[PDB]
Amino acid sequence: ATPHINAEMGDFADVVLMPGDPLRAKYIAETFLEDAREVNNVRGMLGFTGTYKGRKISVMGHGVGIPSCSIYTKELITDFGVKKIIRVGSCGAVLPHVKLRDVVIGMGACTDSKVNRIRFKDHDFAAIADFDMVRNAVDAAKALGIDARVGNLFSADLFYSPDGEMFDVMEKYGILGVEMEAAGIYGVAAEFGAKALTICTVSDHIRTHEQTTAAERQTTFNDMIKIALESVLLGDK
Amino acid sequence: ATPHINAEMGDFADVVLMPGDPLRAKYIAETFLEDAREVNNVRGMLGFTGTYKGRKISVMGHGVGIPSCSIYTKELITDFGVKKIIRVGSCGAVLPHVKLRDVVIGMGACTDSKVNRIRFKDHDFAAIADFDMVRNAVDAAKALGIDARVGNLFSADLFYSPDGEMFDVMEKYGILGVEMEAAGIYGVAAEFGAKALTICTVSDHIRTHEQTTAAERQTTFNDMIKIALESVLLGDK
Amino acid sequence: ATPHINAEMGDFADVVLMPGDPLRAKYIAETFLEDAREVNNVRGMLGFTGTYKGRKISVMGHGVGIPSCSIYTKELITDFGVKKIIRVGSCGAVLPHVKLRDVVIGMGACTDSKVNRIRFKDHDFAAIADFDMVRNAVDAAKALGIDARVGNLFSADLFYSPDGEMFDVMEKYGILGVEMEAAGIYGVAAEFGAKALTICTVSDHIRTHEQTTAAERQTTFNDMIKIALESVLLGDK
Amino acid sequence: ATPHINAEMGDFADVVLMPGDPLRAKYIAETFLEDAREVNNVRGMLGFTGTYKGRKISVMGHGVGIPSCSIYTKELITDFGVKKIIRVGSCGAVLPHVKLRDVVIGMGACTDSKVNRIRFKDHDFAAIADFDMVRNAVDAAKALGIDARVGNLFSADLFYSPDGEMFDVMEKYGILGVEMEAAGIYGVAAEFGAKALTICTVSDHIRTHEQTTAAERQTTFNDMIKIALESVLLGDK
Amino acid sequence: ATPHINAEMGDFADVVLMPGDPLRAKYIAETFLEDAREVNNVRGMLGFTGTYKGRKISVMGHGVGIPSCSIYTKELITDFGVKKIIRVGSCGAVLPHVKLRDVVIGMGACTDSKVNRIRFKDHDFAAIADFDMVRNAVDAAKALGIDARVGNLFSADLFYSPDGEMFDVMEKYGILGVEMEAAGIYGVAAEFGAKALTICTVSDHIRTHEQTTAAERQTTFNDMIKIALESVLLGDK
Amino acid sequence: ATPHINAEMGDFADVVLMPGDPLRAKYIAETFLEDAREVNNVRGMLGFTGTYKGRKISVMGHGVGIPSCSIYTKELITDFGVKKIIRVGSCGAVLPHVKLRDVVIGMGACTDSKVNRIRFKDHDFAAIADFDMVRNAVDAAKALGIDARVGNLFSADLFYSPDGEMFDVMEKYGILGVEMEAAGIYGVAAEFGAKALTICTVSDHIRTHEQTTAAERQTTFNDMIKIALESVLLGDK
């Protein structure tokens, strides 16, 4: 193959993990997958396919923003027979009780983008994740002794929004974390009949800017990828 | 007491099941609740409180439409300490594979209404259910050997829409059932910090054209009610 | 028989008075109509057909909100030959010089609902009543010695609006009363080819906070009814 | 003197007839007004003040489009004590049963402009005329033997609309005439606290394509004027 | 001839300069054109054709507002073979560094209007001028030793806006001048394949509050006119 | 430094060239810049600073989509004192007369994103480039014997849009090319007072899918970078 993915049917697994930063795709491939092979290099957006406890899995970065992940998720769904897409990354929190490094599952994703209105006759489309995929992630987290919060995410189109008051609105309606893809990926999944989920670890807090050692961020990132990988094995059962 | 509810703090359980039809409320109370007392009759919107296997439960109609159910769920949450509201109604299908008598659970709900937009600064609020309630519900239907699909519902403002092109859209983006309140109820729950879930049985198929009616229809409807009642018992454990 | 009305062409007169409260429909039929006969109880939305000074009149509640009265007004207009709908309901005042028990005639109706935008390719549709019906009502009022302000009403989707600033805007633009149906009825009448008028009794003040009290509500409630009924006779002449 | 009117408080009567065409203002002042005096020629937007059967009347063009008549109606209302504005203009018919020379009274006015949405927090404002003025006009018409339809007008921003399908929507909703000011005037009157009414003569048919012809345009043009003028007298009584 | 222009193919040049004021049109013609004949007077919108240094030029007012100038520019392009339209008006500044008597060229134009949205499927159409005309204009002002700023204009629907918060916005995003037609004219030009440019002199500063008036103001206004006339001579070479 | 740029004030030039694909930043640095140095590697988004004919210049990829380039352009403007941003990439054409490999300058950029409406109080912001930067690019192109088309670009948020009819609308309003950043970058520039320009070479054509050798695409890409680099030197004069 496609404009952004130079590969053929079969190169990708039916389950693709999608980190924001491409650099992270390689890290995932060599750290959690076995017998990994490179399946895409276009635009430096490296893609890998391999196995995790016998389960075939693919990993590749989806880029920053809704327009970006919309391209990749769509091509994967429609051209490589991808059934599930798990986005793994970070988010900013707005609720006082949502601490840093907390794991958040996007059962739903609010947004200020127009993609879904363009798709849904300018009405309100509830960009949601696949339920089974949400519960798998939650059960997997539980098994790893991790606490996982489930609820709405907010997919911002502007990391630097002109409306600083929107953060208060998000806080008032329970938004768990602010990121930039969920709403988009959920839109594509519904459009092409596939299943999607977004998992985020809280990076910063719009509140008091705390601090996390590079070691801690590393630990939390591996925890999230484990949740994702284990949730897939749960979904297969 | 409040404008639309002639009761006092205590008259309701902390969990309220809400069908659209007040007459259906009475039916629920006399069929599944023991020692059900009538706690409200204002505007004919019958409310009842009783016990289901020892747990205090209430059931009350919320009328038809987001504007209607918004008033009641809100007054329940803010004046009668209700912590959970489970809407138990019917819906029409648009997807071919969704058959009559199918039990649908609205993890999320799309909509025609402009209510959440008024709440979310004209942005996209993903009206979603409470995850634990969705899961409790799924597990209960499972214990009763009932197949329940989880996904998106569509909350229409107009039961007689002037544009039927919207149905192809709902179908394309996978909406499981068409009703008229979920989006409103999930908006209220988020706005006032409560938890809500909407469970529906398909009573019509806007596709093959067919409105269910038989001992079978009534059997499935009661299953939905038992899934709702049983889900609170699970939420308790 | 339609989906929400178990009646047959003929059970309803060509004009129907419609309060939001089903119990009011009943009260009206008992207090002002002769030979009152119940013609509908589906969903407890009581309907009646009687005689007023010899004229065949019908009265039936329509429920709370645009979605609700849209269903009932539509069904009446298309399956029961109803030519005129007169909504006789309650509203909230926002102007200082408007006090409880005041009777307002909605020559027009503003709204925050999306129904009409949906019907009008997203442009501005001026939800307006039928001129002769407004004139009849104004004339019926003078003949009764009752005062009645004619002007704009505001049909709200959220009785509990999270946007309090909007009331200031309504005030500045002279909204006489805040209710929840007008714009919808006027929307339906235009779409289905019938005529409608909304008469409302100020049951409370949005600024001062005063609900219906004393025995005053009754006669003023009856004033609205008297006006609606007489205006029907003036229209016949 | 305001930015667009070189006059002084007093040069204008408390009611002003306003055609879109400055040359019509002139014709009206010469044909129907006694002691006509020019009170404005800024931007060639001719204004006059005379006497009609003893009543001080004023007539001034307002130009084409909402932005234009918004400026003039505003300036008149805030700096020249004008209490009533009667727009006497031309419109296009869209309904089959509406033919050239027909006189329509805009009880309300739909529009595709954004002015009112701007004034009304993006909600629906029902641009409506002053009831008594509409009633006066209807009465003045019967006394003249002239026919006049009362109802909705549609104020268009684009005389040459690229959206032809919209005319079908207008037709379905009974728009009596398509013009370019009503919604604006009604918008201004409400905002600045004055009263307005629009009377229009069907100068052409949007479906059949027929513009003003023969000597008929004149008397029918004069019919509208006669009605507007008389209605002013009825209002005085 | 067309509804608003009483002329015949040929009466105009292929280039029309358009001030908002018809009286200003006459002023242009008698001041800069040789042997100017009047080619239109319908509705008082004076149009003139003459020659500037041997090149055939026309000048005509377009009235005030997008709805007004849209009608005229359109009829000029589609019925009188006009290929270029140069609006020459005034504008108010919002930016501190923009002083009175400053010549502004609208490379682009923002707007309040809903016209382009009707044209562009509710999306964002960037109303822009014709590049060559902008450059011709810049070069001409340069040859005349005049400093001309190029940028965005704001086309307001309401000269008396109900929200002054919009001015801080225009200023923040760098809008150079506030007028009422450019966006409309650029929309028409694109819709009918013509070329348009809007040149403005700052006659008011909504900031320091100051409306220019002196021999100086009139001197700058004539410069703008010469920049416009001279720009066509350049476009020819 | 910033969340996405790990560098300090001074590391970047006041002029930054921004290709879509990061891989292209390195190619530009080693092919057209001298004494280049790496200034950013975060997320693999490589940035370089160096000189072109003595002129200090920086190059770095901005990623795919408005949300992405919005982040980088903003941080560069506000944290590294960047004055000008030139985006260099490709686009799809919709006009029959726009051939492949044609150079297009985005004087303006239409879009279906909501970023500018969020910024401009939901009104129409004309996302435009800096004029001088546009003319420099055009003159530079001319000097290289290259033909450059100037006009509107369309910044799509969905590379795979559900509305296939939008391409016809774009064609009707002269859109020169379809890409995905312009509107966004122009928005940020206006918000933070900097200058921006977008240059694109036509890659595909929504019409007949022609073909271009890798050699030809290489030649055209170098031509575009030369235009950009030379336009900067022209802007300095």
**Whether F114 and A119 lie within 8 Å, measured CB to CB:** no
Rounded Cα–Cα distance for residues D50 and D59 (Å): 8
Rounded Cα–Cα distance for residues D167 and B160 (Å): 22
Cβ neighbours, 10 Å, residue C145: 7
Rounded Cα–Cα distance for residues D42 and D34 (Å): 23
- One of C11, C102, C130, C204 is an active-site residue; which one? C204
Residue D139's Cβ-count burial label (10 Å; 0-12, 13-18, 19+) is middle
Asked if E174 has any chain F CB less than 8 Å from its own CB, the reply is yes
Is the distance from CB of C19 to CB of C225 less than 8 angstroms?
A: no
With residue D189 as reference, give the H or E element that holds it. Answer: helix D182-192
Rounded Cα–Cα distance for residues A199 and A182 (Å): 9
* CA angle, C195 then C200 then C205, to 5°: 150
- Residues of chain B with Cβ-Cβ distance to C64 below 8 Å are 4, 43, 63, 65, 67-68, 71
A81 dihedral zone (left: phi>0; alpha: psi -120 to 50; beta): left
Give the β-pairing of D55-60 and D84-93: unpaired
The set of catalytic residues of D is: 204
Maximal C-alpha separation, chain B = 48
| Single-letter amino acid code for the residue at E61 | G
User: Which of B43, B157, B158 is closest, CB to CB, to C21?
Assistant: B43
**Whether F124 and E111 lie within 8 Å, measured CB to CB:** yes
Q: Which of B123, B134, B147, B149 would best serve as a mutation to test chain A binding (most A beta carbons within 10 A)?
A: B123
> Taking the mean position of all CA atoms in its chain, how far away is CA B134?
12
Q: C92 a known binding residue?
A: no
Q: How far is F197 from chain A (nearest CA, A)?
A: 20
With residue E17 as reference, give the H or E element that holds it. Answer: strand E15-18
- Residue F6: φ, ψ to 5°: -95, 85
Rounded Cα–Cα distance for residues E74 and E173 (Å): 30
Asked if D22 has any chain E CB less than 8 Å from its own CB, the reply is yes
- Would you say the C-alpha torsion D87, D91, D95, D97 has a positive or negative sign? positive
Is the distance from CB of C7 to CB of C1 less than 8 angstroms?
A: yes
DSSP D96: T
Helix D131-144 vs helix C131-144: angle between axes, to the nearest 10 degrees?
100
Asked if A194 has any chain B CB less than 8 Å from its own CB, the reply is no
Is the distance from CB of A172 to CB of B116 less than 8 angstroms?
A: no
DSSP E33-89: -EEEEEEE-GGG--EEEEEETTEEEEEE---SSHHHHHHHHHHHHHHS---EEEEEE
Asked if A166 has any chain B CB less than 8 Å from its own CB, the reply is yes
The resolution, in Å, is 2.7
Alpha helices, H only, F53-112: 66-79
- Residues of chain D with Cβ-Cβ distance to C108 below 8 Å are 107-108, 126, 128
Among D172, D231, D200, CA closest to D90: D200
Rounded Cα–Cα distance for residues B167 and A171 (Å): 34
**Whether E152 and F128 lie within 8 Å, measured CB to CB:** yes
Sequence-ordered list of residues with C-beta below 8 angstroms from that of B86, at least 6 positions apart, any chain: B15, B16, B17, B18, B133, B196, B197, B198, B199, B228, B231, B232
Coil, strand or helix at C215? coil
Among C11, C27, C174, CA closest to C107: C174
Sequence-ordered list of residues with C-beta below 8 angstroms from that of C91, at least 6 positions apart, any chain: C104, C153, C176, C177, C178, C179, C200, C201, C202, C203
* CA angle, B15 then B16 then B18, to 5°: 155
> Could you confirm whether C130 is annotated as catalytic?
no
Rounded Cα–Cα distance for residues F88 and F182 (Å): 10
Rounded Cα–Cα distance for residues A225 and A231 (Å): 10
Rounded Cα–Cα distance for residues C182 and A158 (Å): 39
Buried b (16+ CB within 10 A) or exposed e, F197-209: bbbbbbbbbeeee
Coil, strand or helix at D195? strand
Rounded Cα–Cα distance for residues D33 and D7 (Å): 19
- Residue E171: φ, ψ to 5°: -60, -45
Torsion of CA C138, C142, C148, C153, to 10 degrees: -10
Q: Copy the structure tokens of residue E130.
A: 């014709």
Sequence-ordered list of residues with C-beta below 8 angstroms from that of D237, at least 6 positions apart, any chain: none
Give the 3-state secondary structure percentages of chain A, helix then strand then coil, rounded to 5. 35, 30, 35
Q: Copy the structure tokens of residue B139.
A: 């597990």
Helix A131-143 vs helix B131-143: angle between axes, to the nearest 10 degrees?
100
Is the distance from CB of F96 to CB of F207 less than 8 angstroms?
A: yes
Q: Which of D97, D112, D123 would best serve as a mutation to test chain C binding (most C beta carbons within 10 A)?
A: D123
**Whether B43 and C20 lie within 8 Å, measured CB to CB:** yes
- Would you say the C-alpha torsion A9, A12, A13, A17 has a positive or negative sign? negative
Asked if D14 has any chain E CB less than 8 Å from its own CB, the reply is no
Helix D216-236 vs helix D131-144: angle between axes, to the nearest 10 degrees?
120
Experimental method: X-ray
- Residues of chain A with Cβ-Cβ distance to F23 below 8 Å are 43-44
Torsion of CA B21, B22, B27, B29, to 10 degrees: 130
Q: How far is C221 from chain D (nearest CA, A)?
A: 24
Alpha helices, H only, chain B: 22-32, 66-79, 115-119, 131-143, 165-172, 182-191, 215-236
Among E89, E90, E94, E91, CA closest to E174: E94
- Calculate the alpha carbon distances from A18 to A23, A198, A229, A237 in Å: 11, 9, 12, 22
Q: Copy the structure tokens of residue C208.
A: 């001062």
Alpha helices, H only, B144-193: 165-172, 182-191
Rounded Cα–Cα distance for residues A30 and D153 (Å): 69
- Calculate the alpha carbon distances from D10 to B65, D1, F131 in Å: 54, 11, 50
The domains found in chain C, sorted by start residue, are 1-237 (3.40.50.1580)
Coil, strand or helix at B110? strand
Given the structure tokens 């060559």, which residue do they identify? E132
Coil, strand or helix at B232? helix
Given the structure tokens 């604006």, which residue do they identify? D184
Q: Give the residue from chain F lying closest to A73, CA to CA.
A: F160
Rounded Cα–Cα distance for residues E47 and C42 (Å): 69
Cβ neighbours, 10 Å, residue F165: 10
- Residues of chain E with Cβ-Cβ distance to D19 below 8 Å are none
DSSP A43: G
Residues present in chain A in total? 237
Helix F131-143 vs helix E131-143: angle between axes, to the nearest 10 degrees?
100
DSSP A210: -
Sequence-ordered list of residues with C-beta below 8 angstroms from that of F13, at least 6 positions apart, any chain: F49, F56, F57, F58, F82
